[PDB]
Design a protein around this ligand. Structure first.
Ligand SMILES: OC[C@H]1O[C@@H](O[C@H]2[C@H](O)[C@@H](O)[C@H](O)O[C@@H]2CO)[C@H](O)[C@@H](O)[C@H]1O
Ligand SMILES: [Cl-]
Length: 138
């Protein structure tokens, strides 16, 4: 397996038609997962499943610029389960990141950071066993 937190370099940043695939298993009694697509210290796209926010399960998405979080985009559809294997696919499209979990469309996130070619790292963290992290062009 891979060590968590895991840094996946994205050479030359992201580009439409780039597909990032993360395979892992959620730990029992998990609290959180996070994917952080970074542009240096900025987080272009933070994708953050929360297993217990006031006894609710929610996915929080956001952008961090100059160390400040912006407006949260929340998704109540929650395909993850403690103890279970998952696949997250993030497809870069011209105007948004498109996320599918276990082959089912989950959400889209409009590009706030527009210099796609400078989003050159993906951090993967949280309460998971990480099996694989890779990318390909479709
Ligand atoms: O927005 C992503 C960011 O959220 C931080 O937590 C927020 C929390 O979601 C919000 O309800 C409250 O008003 O402010 C907190 C601090 O900004 C997390 O700390 C951070 O890790 C990100 O997940
Ligand atoms: Cl930008």
């Amino acid at each position: 397996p891979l060590i968590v937190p895991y840094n996946l370099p994205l050479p030359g940043g992201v580009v439409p038609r780039m597909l990032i695939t993360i395979l892992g298993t959620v730990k029992p009694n998990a609290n959180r997962i996070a994917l952080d697509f970074q542009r240096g210290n900025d987080v272009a796209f933070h994708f953050n499943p929360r297993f217990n926010e006031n006894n609710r399960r929610v996915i929080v998405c956001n952008t961090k610029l100059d160390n400040n979080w912006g407006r949260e985009e929340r998704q109540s559809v929650f395909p993850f389960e403690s103890g279970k294997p998952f696949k997250i696919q993030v497809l870069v499209e011209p105007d948004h990141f498109k996320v599918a979990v276990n082959d089912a469309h989950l959400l889209q996130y409009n590009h706030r950071v527009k210099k796609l070619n400078e989003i050159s790292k993906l951090g993967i963290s949280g309460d998971i066993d990480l099996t694989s992290a890779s990318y390909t062009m479709i």
